[PDB]
Amino acid sequence: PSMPAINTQTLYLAGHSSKLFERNVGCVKTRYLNQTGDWVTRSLIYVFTFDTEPWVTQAGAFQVKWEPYSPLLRVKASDYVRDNLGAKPDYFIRTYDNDFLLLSDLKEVRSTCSLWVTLKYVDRIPETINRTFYTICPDPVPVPFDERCYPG
Numbered sequence: 001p002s003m004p005a006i007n008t009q010t011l012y013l014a015g016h017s018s019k020l021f022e023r024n025v026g027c028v029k030t031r032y033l034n035q036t037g038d039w040v041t042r043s044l045i046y047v048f049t050f051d052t053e054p055w056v057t058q059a060g061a062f063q064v065k066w067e068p069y070s071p072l073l074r075v076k077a078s079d080y081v082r083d084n085l086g087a088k089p090d091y092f093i094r095t096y097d098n099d100f101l102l103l104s105d106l107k108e109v110r111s112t113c114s115l116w117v118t119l120k121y122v123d124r125i126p127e128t129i130n131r132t133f134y135t136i137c138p139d140p141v142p143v144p145f146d147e148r149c150y151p152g
């Protein structure tokens with residue numbers, strides 16, 4: 001079935017547990033690139049937010065595997081994405097719909113969250129999604145809305 005990590009729509013980071021924070025790493029999103037067998041190749045696009053010099057758009061690739069109805073998302077990250085952004089080889093899928101995905105850290109006990117949404121919800125997340133995020137995630141920090149990340 002359809003789950004956002006293996007679908008073609010772009011996902012934008014809407015929130016995360018505070019412990020995950022990386023200074024000057026903004027406008028985080030992942031685009032769908034292609035698929036080979038059960039592995040979907042996505043890009044991780046981010047902007048190096050200096051104040052100043054001018055902002056630097058960066059892109060690294062990674063692959064994901066999802067067995068149908070599995071609670072786990074397999075992630076095969078590149079060395080750059082892995083070492084620089086801390087991408088883990090597995091994430092726990094808490095819940096999702098076509099327009100959102102809530103992932104947790106599998107190995108950590110105080111399991112860090114990352115909340116992802118499709119373009120319609122960057123300015124405002126639905127009360128239901130927001131309530132789930134704030135209930136089950138430790139130190140929930142929303143990503144603030146910034147028109148420079150998606151001029152439109």
Ligand SMILES: *[C@@H]1O[C@H](CO[C@@H]2O[C@@H](C)[C@@H](O)[C@@H](O)[C@@H]2O)[C@@H](O[C@@H]2O[C@H](CO)[C@@H](O[C@H]3O[C@H](CO)[C@@H](O)[C@H](O)[C@@H]3O)[C@H](O)[C@H]2NC(C)=O)[C@H](O)[C@H]1NC(C)=O
Nearest residue numbers: 123124125126127128129130131132133134135136140142
């Ligand atoms: C996303 O959810 C945030 C968390 O909501 C809280 O936790 C949920 C699990 C649920 O229990 C819900 O009922 C809780 O409110 C939202 O943050 C909360 O927003 C409140 C805004 O009214 C805030 O309060 C403020 O306002 C009162 C006046 O009515 C003041 O007296 C008070 O000092 C506050 O300023 C509340 O404290 C806050 N809670 C937390 C834990 O941060 C958030 O708004 C929501 N966002 C969206 C996009 O819906």
Ligand SMILES: CC(C)CCC[C@@H](C)[C@H]1CC[C@H]2[C@@H]3CC=C4C[C@@H](O)CC[C@]4(C)[C@H]3CC[C@]12C
Nearest residue numbers: 005016020021022025028030044085086087114
């Ligand atoms: C979205 C799906 C398909 C999988 C994404 C997997 C990887 C690439 C994701 C999962 C959790 C993500 C991290 C979550 C939180 C933060 C803190 C923020 O301040 C900078 C980005 C950063 C560091 C993210 C980088 C990318 C990340 C490691």
Ligand SMILES: *[C@@H]1O[C@H](CO)[C@@H](O)[C@H](O)[C@H]1NC(C)=O
Nearest residue numbers: 032033034035036041042061
């Ligand atoms: C597409 O897949 C190829 C190999 O299958 C890979 O090199 C590339 O990163 C993917 N993305 C695009 C858009 O080329």
Ligand SMILES: [Cl-]
Nearest residue numbers: 049050051052
């Ligand atoms: Cl600024």
Ligand SMILES: [Cl-]
Nearest residue numbers: 125126127128
């Ligand atoms: Cl709503």
